[PDB]
Design a protein around this nucleic acid. Structure first.
Ligand SMILES: [Zn+2]
Length: 675
RNA sequence: CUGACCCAGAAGAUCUACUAAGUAGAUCUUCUGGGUCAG
């Protein structure tokens, strides 16, 4: 058995008396072993003929698997039954039987939320000890807060039933939107009332051991200047002006479609303006349908090209010009191969006229991003002293990950670096996700004396995921909140670690400094709370809980009624009729398909299974995909590909999700496909 | 029955920027259902 340290025993001491405790301790101090000690002491306290049941909550699948393994290995000699349920372990055995036939259960919180909503688990009285991992997530509409709402409704309801003891583990409670110490204290009291905690446990009499175990890295701030002369931006701005003039020719009122004023190229405000203009131009209707179709298609193309130009400007701002040029080239190749008509012909020719000068500019070694030069200098200096350095690099977008990996690999001065890539799992319009086995493989490969010494990642590596110790942390234009800042510096716990923040904007550094001051506010508030009498704290928490319960009980609102009128679905790019809502069928309340031979003529299929597109030539707008259901291969459509026009009134509306569109949803019938 | 891959829905949190609380864009996570390949 591992020998517990003194500060671990001090942290676990309040919980071993049966008090609801939030344990706040730095990252890397071993809160898992503290939870193990608390669970071991809790289970052995019951008299003969009685038993206690413990549930552990994990927020991610890898953490759930790791906790299940740790608990199973630690309690295997004691004769306790350990199990776990998650998304991959759910539809096998009834959950109530699994809970009743085990002593320690590792869960994802949504499983318990689902089973409490269903009624399979009627109450939380079946557990005697509840442990929340990363307890700072217990706010707003998180599943943690749903479980705690169930708990608190049972508590403040007169139901004389036993309730479990609640333990939470975190590294930072946070301050929310606090500006002074009073607001921070109010926020911390509210968080304590969420978890029914009356004690906050910190290391006081054993600080020296904690510092010899966990070391806080030194923080640096690096501000750089932007480019002096930008020819790339000049050319792209001229192209954007020409496109804007072309769009104004068709639509004379373009400047009154959006209320954004003083827009500038290459900014988020311009992107909001162009998105608003796009959504306004796709609902224009005219008595003449051919004129409406041609005008809407022209405006669609113009606005899409303007949006791509703005995206390229932003990419060039945060990376090399070559990345932006490649992005534009890929878009224009897809445009050339995606329904080349006369307007697309003109736009492509106008781009090709300047492509030569664009390529000449991006290949000049005097136009490199100063941010990249500073990053290269930092990496060179840090790896000169310690050749065995392990680095992690935080960026904002998934495209920046690939751009920086390419820049590192192509850099002759960074030949000692072996980049590794880590992104999220979900899929986007331009990027594919990363599967769990791939993430585990890269995480295992990234370590000392391994295949990689530098990791480029998005916010995946912020919380929960176990990573090898890093001597260097670089934040590339990367600032969040106080919890994120405290967690991020828990990655360089090694002695002599450093953290660097790289930016060309002063507000970024100012925000990081504001976070560093809010941290002191939070520490002072915690120290003030620990000196109160426990009865007064309990009364305060009870009052807060009563007020919150009253508000949330009064907040509940009803659900409106869907519309029974027939509607038309039109192509969002060319306004051609696709189908009516009378031909839409729902498969198992989540797949939407179209029945009839008329719809089959309105689309073409081009090769997973084949996608479907608008059959009208020169448009080829994406409409959906083919899926297999039982013995049938039917097509499924996306609501965000169509404009919804009412038959009677004639107004047109846009929707982004199928739940926003309220209409009669007729279930699919296998024998219906005969009329 | 195990793995590996994909598709469709829905929910949650964070950040930035707008308009007069909502809106866009980005990042990450979770749950439900439908398929493919290998053993
Ligand atoms: Zn079309």
């Amino acid at each position: 058995p591992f020998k517990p340290r003194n500060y671990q025993l001090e942290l676990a001491l309040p919980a071993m008396k049966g008090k609801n405790t939030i344990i706040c301790a730095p990252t890397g101090c071993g809160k898992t072993f503290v939870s193990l000690l608390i669970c071991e002491h809790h289970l052995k306290k019951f008299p003969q003929g009685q038993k206690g049941k413990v549930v552990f909550f994990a927020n991610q699948i890898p953490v759930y698997e790791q906790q299940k393994s740790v608990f199973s290995k630690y309690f295997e000699r004691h004769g306790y039954r350990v199990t776990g349920i998650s998304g991959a372990t759910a539809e096998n055995v009834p959950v109530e039987q699994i809970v009743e036939n085990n002593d320690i259960i590792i869960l994802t919180p949504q499983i318990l939320v689902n089973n409490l909503k269903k009624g399979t688990i009627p109450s939380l009285s079946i557990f005697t000890l509840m442990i929340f991992d990363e307890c700072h997530n217990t706010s707003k509409q998180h599943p943690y807060n749903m479980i705690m709402f169930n708990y608190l409704d049972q508590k403040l309801g007169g139901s004389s039933g036993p309730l479990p003891q609640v333990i939470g583990l975190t590294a930072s409670v946070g301050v929310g939107d606090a500006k002074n110490t009073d607001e921070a204290l109010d926020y911390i009291c509210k968080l304590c009332a969420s978890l029914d905690a009356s004690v906050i446990a910190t290391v006081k009499h054993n600080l020296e051991e904690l510092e010899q175990v966990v070391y806080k890295p030194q923080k640096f701030f690096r501000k750089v200047e932007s480019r002096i002369s930008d020819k790339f931006k000049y050319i792209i701005a001229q192209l954007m002006r020409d496109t804007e003039s072309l769009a104004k020719r068709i639509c004379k009122d373009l400047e009154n479609l959006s209320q954004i004023q003083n827009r500038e190229f290459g900014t988020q405000k311009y992107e909001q303006w162009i998105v608003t203009v796009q959504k306004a131009c796709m609902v224009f209707q005219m008595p003449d349908k051919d004129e409406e179709s041609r005008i809407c298609k022209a405006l669609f193309l113009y606005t899409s090209h303007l949006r791509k130009y703005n995206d390229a400007l932003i990419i060039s701002e945060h990376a090399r010009m070559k990345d932006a040029l490649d992005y534009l080239k890929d878009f224009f190749s897809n445009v050339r191969a995606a329904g080349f008509d006369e307007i697309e012909q003109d736009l492509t020719q106008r781009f090709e006229e300047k492509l030569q000068e664009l390529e000449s500019v991006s290949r000049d070694p005097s136009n490199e991003n100063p941010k990249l030069e500073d990053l290269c200098f930092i990496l060179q200096e840090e790896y000169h002293l310690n050749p065995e350095t392990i680095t992690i690099l935080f960026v904002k977008t998934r495209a920046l990950v690939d751009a920086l990996k390419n820049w590192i690999e192509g850099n002759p001065k960074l030949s000692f670096l072996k980049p590794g890539i880590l992104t999220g799992r979900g899929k986007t319009n331009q990027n594919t996700g990363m599967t769990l086995p791939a993430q585990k493989c890269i995480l295992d490969a990234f370590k000392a004396s391994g295949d990689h010494n530098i990791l480029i990642a998005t916010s995946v590596a912020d919380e929960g995921i176990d990573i090898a110790q890093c001597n260097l942390v670089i934040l590339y234009e990367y600032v969040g909140n106080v919890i994120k800042m405290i967690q991020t510096r828990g990655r360089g716990r090694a002695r002599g670690s450093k953290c660097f923040l790289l930016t060309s904007n002063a507000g970024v550094i100012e925000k990081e400094q504001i976070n560093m001051y809010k941290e002191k506010m939070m520490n002072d508030s915690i120290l003030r709370l620990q000196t109160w009498d426990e009865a007064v704290f309990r009364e305060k928490i009870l009052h807060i809980q009563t007020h919150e319960k009253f508000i949330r009980d009064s907040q509940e609102k009803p659900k409106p009624v869907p519309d029974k009128e027939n509607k038309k679905l039109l192509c969002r790019k060319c306004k051609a009729l696709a189908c009516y809502t009378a031909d839409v069928r729902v498969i198992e309340e989540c797949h939407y398909t179209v029945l009839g031979d008329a719809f089959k003529e309105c689309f073409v299929s081009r090769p997973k299974r084949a996608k479907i597109f608008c059959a009208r030539q020169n448009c080829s707008h994406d409409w959906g995909i083919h899926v297999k259901y039982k013995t049938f291969e039917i097509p499924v459509i996306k609501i965000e590909s169509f404009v919804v026009e009412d038959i009677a009134t004639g107004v047109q509306t846009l929707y982004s999700k199928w739940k926003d569109f309220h209409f009669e949803k007729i279930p699919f019938d296998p024998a219906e496909m005969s009329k």
